[PDB]
Write an enzyme that holds these catalytic residues in place. Structure first.
Site, PDB file in Angstrom:
ATOM      1  N   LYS A   1       0.810  -1.220   0.000  1.00 55.95           N
ATOM      2  CA  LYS A   1       0.000   0.000   0.000  1.00 55.95           C
ATOM      3  C   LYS A   1       0.845   1.272   0.000  1.00 55.95           C
ATOM      4  O   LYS A   1       0.366   2.345  -0.351  1.00 55.95           O
ATOM      5  CB  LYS A   1      -1.015   0.036   1.152  1.00 55.95           C
ATOM      6  CG  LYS A   1      -2.038  -1.105   1.087  1.00 55.95           C
ATOM      7  CD  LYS A   1      -2.877  -1.097  -0.185  1.00 55.95           C
ATOM      8  CE  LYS A   1      -4.209  -1.803  -0.016  1.00 55.95           C
ATOM      9  NZ  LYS A   1      -4.021  -3.152   0.519  1.00 55.95           N
TER      10      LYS A   1
ATOM     11  N   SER B   1      -2.334 -12.629   3.906  1.00 53.69           N
ATOM     12  CA  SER B   1      -2.648 -12.586   2.484  1.00 53.69           C
ATOM     13  C   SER B   1      -1.503 -13.187   1.684  1.00 53.69           C
ATOM     14  O   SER B   1      -1.754 -13.747   0.619  1.00 53.69           O
ATOM     15  CB  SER B   1      -2.962 -11.168   1.989  1.00 53.69           C
ATOM     16  OG  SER B   1      -1.829 -10.351   2.232  1.00 53.69           O
TER      17      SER B   1
END
Lengths: 310, 310
Positions: free
Chosen positions: B41, B271
């Protein structure tokens, strides 16, 4: 550029210019938090294993034993997993639940010594386990293993040289094992031939390097600047390449790390704050104001969530 | 190579070959945990701010509002600190003490909405605050902002191309906003001209992409694979470039992340485990066994110390 394992991915960490420290951007920071196990120690975790392989002291089937639970423990854990060694870390039973989890997550055999014995307890228990089968166990000994400073001479130092186009004038590094300041200094001074100022940073609470160099009585003390201030001169600190020693107190190191976070958007650990506070002091002396200062930021913020940093 | 602030230091993350997954090293992982705020991110935190600056929607004195407390929150926090913006993150009051501390450490104005209202509560409160002074506040909107996939087309994708010497055949990425798989796919397919297989990964518990593409009823569900499985098709997921959707269950994603840690010495998040389990499945189908599979590992392990990962 595909690494055969995570150990080979060490380094190539970036230089970021500070805006709220130094004078006219003369202070630049090297982000060691960006490494496979998220610390400067990833470099020495890699190289100490590689070197012990090359010299035959570490082979398939030999196990690794080291008495720490800090960044070096985490670094050796990742390398051991990557390269297929069983690793035993010794440490007191009173250690952080979260460090236990992180190391256990990394597949470390944890040997929880007497809490009352503490660190002393762990060094001995390491020695004990190795003694029990010396053909089976190897202690890499981060405080004295030349492979520690050597990796900094071959990677960290040249990266600084390259990234600054040879303009670096000052390197500021906190001393734990001494490997970073030693290796970096050897690279820049001896391999590249530039007479920079090498600055060791130590807690004012435990200023054993300053005391030694002044021929004062050595008086170690407790502090909160994790990763530095071991309370003795490690063999991997080459005093001969140190030009200056700066002391920083725990509170200043903490407040500085919080400023790095809140004002620079840099996610650094406690030792990072100490190294920057020392760098900032030099950067605001007229003798250093036209000089490029490079500061090692050894680790990242999330490793400190349980600490005084927050 | 000195970055003017931490936002410019994004990316150039390494490729590591897995030894205990795939077949004959056909599975390679891209370590996004290595970035300024330690997640993929960081790229979109940087580019969304830069883009809003370039188009005039973000100026000095305007404040940023975003309804999340995840990796994007942390990314916007670091960029906001680095570039001199006040940032308000909305989030339920029931959020992790540690995330509160980390974001507060980063200088975020935290707006703790009704816990009972939860996520819904936060999106509305974001909208509310912006509505109250639209000339003052900007919501960057990570699910729909084209600057999200665009940064992946300009950085993440080309890095994969470069590092693999154009040999990448398959890219596996979990979908949260969809930006990673979208941008990477556009770069490799459209800019470099290679017909790779783009594989989206989603939780079996919330397989809304699989359901949509099959023209089945969309049925979102709770899962533990943090960062993916938002329970809808985000606008930043370009379904047109997706060749395949793989579903992974929470337990498998968790066990896979633990294997990455214990067997590979790779410090990846939940993830990351999901993305690798999907990659491993493809890598062991004969149709993909001579093909180079590249897997995005979005985050690092220490962000998950309070979670089921440990």
């Amino acid at each position: 550029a595909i690494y055969a394992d995570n150990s080979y991915s060490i380094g190539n960490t970036p230089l970021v210019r500070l805006k709220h420290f130094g004078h006219n951007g003369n202070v630049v920071v090297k982000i060691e938090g960006r490494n496979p196990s998220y610390s400067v120690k990833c470099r020495i975790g890699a190289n100490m294993v590689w070197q012990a392989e090359k010299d035959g002291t570490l082979t398939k089937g030999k196990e690794i034993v080291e008495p720490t639970s800090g960044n070096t423990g985490i670094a050796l854990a990742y390398v051991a997993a990557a390269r297929g060694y069983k690793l035993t870390l010794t440490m007191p039973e009173t250690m952080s639940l979260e460090r236990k989890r992180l190391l256990c997550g990394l597949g470390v055999n944890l040997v929880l010594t007497e809490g009352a014995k503490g660190m002393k307890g762990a060094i001995a228990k390491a020695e004990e386990i190795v003694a029990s089968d010396p053909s089976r166990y190897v202690m890499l000994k981060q405080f004295e293993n030349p492979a520690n400073p050597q990796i900094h001479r071959e990677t960290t130092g040249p990266e600084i040289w390259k990234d600054t186009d040879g303009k670096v004038d000052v390197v500021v590094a906190g001393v734990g094992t001494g490997g970073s300041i030693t290796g970096i200094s050897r690279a820049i001074k001896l391999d590249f031939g530039k007479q920079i100022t090498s600055v060791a940073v130590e807690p004012v609470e435990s200023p054993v390097i300053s005391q030694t160099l002044a021929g004062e009585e050595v008086k170690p003390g407790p502090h909160k600047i994790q990763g530095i201030g071991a309370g003795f001169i490690p063999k991997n600190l080459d005093l001969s390449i140190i030009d200056r020693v700066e002391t920083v107190d725990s509170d200043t190191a903490l407040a500085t790390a919080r400023r790095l976070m809140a004002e620079e958007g840099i996610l650094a650990g406690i030792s990072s704050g100490a190294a920057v506070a020392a760098a900032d002091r030099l950067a605001k002396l007229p003798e250093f104001a036209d000089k490029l200062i490079v500061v090692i930021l050894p680790s990242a913020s999330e490793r400190y969530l349980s600490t005084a940093l927050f």
